[PDB]
């Protein structure tokens, strides 16, 4: 394919006309470009880069090449998370919180390549997560919002083919990222978009300053697509909630929603994100956003809204979270020395959890009885590990020991000279 | 004064014979060398410094040309803190805790110009600060422990004079510092000593790595002093205890003593600190130090030992901590926004607390209702300002407002895009 010639142009660092970008994406989509080529193009991007014009062309080119939906209700509203913080079951609260206002939010998520549990997986536990794109329009119009697995439908297909190349080469050039995150939003073609970023260490974007740099890229890019976007910088110090893994995250999520009372990380993050959406939506005036969500969630209206979603999904609406399954095999870690918790390491926790088999096995996961800065005395449980297989529970345990995810410290950090 | 001849040598970087060090000190104590020379000499050290041999020779010399004490009881135990943390009334708990073991423990404290409240200052509130060098031996033998103001005694008088230059020049050279801290302890000729090095930001020693280097320096020099010394790095991240200012700390410190139950920050540190000494003392076998200390305080033996001291001090044991006086007029800060406290600035509080004018007014001070990692709903008290007189309090408040000493944050750290 002559499409290659354009790829070579990038190799030499040249900018790409929309005509050139489309041809490549077009060929990528038609399976006229095999793995060898996508890899080279991908490698070129990391090396040479894309200036903004190219990215916007790419997002559009990538998106336009995939099925798109138009929702009668408007304006469309969407929430996406850069991610990287374990135990992020929040998005689930927000859609319901956002939806009850009656604004329209069709939320699509993907099973996670590197997370213990994909947002999709968490939903799957208590509801169906795959539907035809046509099926999706109905749910949203009828119920006004939805949670569905993004992958089991074709959008921004070029991206899917593309991802394999990055992971194999273990690289995520930014331009490709913005295109993938944004274009898929475009296919849904939502008008107002909010992007959430977890910031800290053990997070995808460790540095806030880097995080700020992303928003500009995200917001500015939205303009190119004429989408109103807002970036939210989020605390990423500890995994949100005390539950990691799909069964656990789900339990944690529904219970908060139903009760309207939850761990601060979940409730606070979700409400805050939700509020921004409402302001963008115009339901709530600037500065009143946190209030409407707490009231909305607090009201229990939100739980009720969620029920419609569960019902559309095929999950029984009534279901009592407390009755959800968890793996029979479990081990719990007593604290080694009395003190306070200096730190919790997210990268490790996910890893400890994935070892247990999440997300392939829904039951497996981790539950934390503690939060950073919580005082401890010897024997307080730091976390509980759930697995559906003995072999995994054991394998996870090895990791738990090496990793030392929960770090406990005392006033005397170290003693010198004996 | 030929002492200058030796001083000039330091300018040329030559090492100093003990006589040279001795002579300079001899002149300084004698008042032979006035301010120009002291500063000049002091200046050379920062620029050139001293190898341990010099630091050792100097330490004694400053020490020898000063009153010294010999104690019948043995071994001699002294606990000293580098400082920089606020509210560190912790030594108070440790001294009494140490005494019950009955191991000997003479204590010298000097009110700190920089610090809001001197340990000497807090002890003074419930007792009398100053005693004759001769009296202390008497006091020490009867109870085996004492709290006194180092300042009345003519110790390392060489030390006092050099300090004006340091503060005046705003430089603290390490070699002189060890000497000032060490020489005085040596004059007591204390057999065993321990070093506390609050580590964090806003502390005198910001970084742990810095602390380790000192310890080698601190413990290593002690050998020259044929002194067994152990240095313990300690957590300086936030104020120790929740009371700042002499009276408040006093109320806090004593109550902790009577109760055996107190704010975690102080009790754990004091107890932990005590252990090194007991273990160091040998009363308790290694690793048993923290435990024995906890029990001793819990037993309530420590408060009583504390009881003996007030009597020796002229303080009254029947004394009821609650009835200690406090500033008549108070102002406190409600939380600006709902959230979880992210950090507390120690440097800021002291200035804020000093603004109330402590330690000139014992009554003035700061009491904190919240500590880091503590979720705060909007309107929760962060701290409370106590002052004897208003002009200061307003002055204090004004200072507080600029500083924003207590910081509260949310999951959405920052919002971009409006």
UniProtKB/Swiss-Prot annotation, chains A, B:
Active site: 172 (proton donor)
Listed EC numbers: 2.4.2.57
Similarity comment: family membership: Belongs to the thymidine/pyrimidine-nucleoside phosphorylase family. Type 2 subfamily.
Its biological purpose: Catalyzes the conversion of AMP and phosphate to adenine and ribose 1,5-bisphosphate (R15P). Exhibits phosphorylase activity toward CMP, dCMP and UMP in addition to AMP. Functions in an archaeal AMP degradation pathway, together with R15P isomerase and RubisCO.
Activity regulation: AMP phosphorolysis is allosterically regulated by the substrate AMP.
Record field: catalytic activity: AMP + phosphate = alpha-D-ribose 1,5-bisphosphate + adenine; CMP + phosphate = cytosine + alpha-D-ribose 1,5-bisphosphate; UMP + phosphate = alpha-D-ribose 1,5-bisphosphate + uracil
GO BP annotation list: AMP catabolic process; pyrimidine deoxyribonucleoside metabolic process; pyrimidine nucleobase metabolic process
Residues where AMP binds: 84, 110-115, 119, 180, 204
UniProt GO cellular component terms: cytosol
Keywords in alphabetical order: Allosteric enzyme, Glycosyltransferase, Transferase
Parent sequence residues shown: 85 to 502 of 503
UniProt name for this protein: AMP phosphorylase
Effect seen on changing residue 172 to N/A: Almost complete loss of activity
Induction (free text): Constitutively expressed (at protein level). Does not respond to the addition of nucleosides.
Gene Ontology molecular function terms on file: 1,4-alpha-oligoglucan phosphorylase activity; AMP binding; pentosyltransferase activity; phosphate ion binding
Protein source organism: Thermococcus kodakarensis (strain ATCC BAA-918 / JCM 12380 / KOD1) (Pyrococcus kodakaraensis (strain KOD1))
EC category name: transferase
Summary of subunit composition and partner proteins: Forms an exceptionally large macromolecular structure (>40-mers) in solution.
UniProt note: domains: The N-terminal domain (residues 1-84), characteristic of archaeal AMPpases, is essential for enzymatic activity, participating in multimerization as well as domain closure of the active site upon substrate binding. Harbors two dimer interfaces within a single molecule: one by the central domain and the other by the C-terminal domain; these two interactions can continuously occur in a repetitive manner, leading to multimerization.
């Amino acid at each position: 394919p002559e499409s290659v010639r354009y790829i070579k142009k990038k190799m030499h660092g040249e900018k790409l006309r929309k005509v050139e970008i489309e041809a490549i994406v077009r060929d990528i989509v038609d399976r006229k470009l095999r793995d060898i080529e996508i890899s080279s193009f991908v490698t070129a991007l990391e090396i040479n880069g894309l200036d903004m014009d190219e990215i916007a062309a790419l997002t559009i080119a990538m998106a336009e090449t995939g099925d798109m939906l138009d929702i009668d209700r408007k304006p469309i509203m969407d929430v996406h998370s850069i991610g990287g913080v374990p135990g992020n079951k929040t998005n689930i609260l927000v859609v319901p919180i956002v939806a009850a206002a009656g604004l329209t939010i069709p939320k699509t998520s993907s099973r996670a390549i590197t997370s213990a549990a994909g947002t999709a997986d968490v939903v799957e536990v208590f509801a169906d997560v795959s539907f035809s794109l046509d099926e999706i329009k109905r749910i949203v119009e009828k119920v006004g919002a939805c949670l569905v697995w993004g992958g089991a439908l074709n959008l921004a297909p070029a991206d899917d083919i593309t991802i394999k190349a990055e992971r194999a080469l273990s690289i995520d050039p930014t331009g490709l990222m913005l295109a993938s995150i944004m274009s898929k939003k475009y296919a849904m073609g939502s008008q107002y978009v909010l992007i959430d970023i977890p910031t800290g260490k053990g997070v995808k974007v460790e540095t806030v300053e880097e995080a700020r740099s992303l928003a500009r890229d995200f917001i500015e890019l939205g303009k190119r697509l004429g989408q109103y976007v807002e970036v939210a910088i989020t605390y990423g110090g500890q995994p949100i909630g005390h539950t990691v893994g799909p069964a656990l995250e789900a339990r944690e999520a529904l219970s908060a929603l139903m009760t309207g009372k939850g761990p601060g990380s979940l409730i606070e993050k979700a409400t805050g994100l939700a509020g921004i959406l409402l302001e963008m939506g115009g339901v709530a005036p600037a500065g009143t956003g946190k209030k409407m969500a707490k009231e909305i969630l607090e009201s229990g209206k939100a739980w009720e809204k969620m029920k419609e979603i569960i019902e559309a999904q095929g999950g029984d609406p009534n279901i009592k979270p407390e009755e959800i399954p968890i793996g029979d095999k479990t081990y719990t870690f007593t604290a080694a020395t009395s003190g306070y918790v200096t730190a919790i390491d997210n990268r490790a926790i996910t890893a400890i959890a994935r070892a247990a088999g999440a997300p392939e096995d829904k039951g497996a996961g981790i539950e934390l009885y503690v939060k950073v800065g919580e005082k401890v005395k010897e024997g307080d449980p730091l976390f509980t590990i759930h697995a559906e297989h003995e072999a995994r529970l054991d394998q996870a345990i090895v990791l738990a020991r090496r990793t030392e995810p929960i770090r406990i410290e005392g006033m005397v950090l170290q003693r010198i000279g004996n």
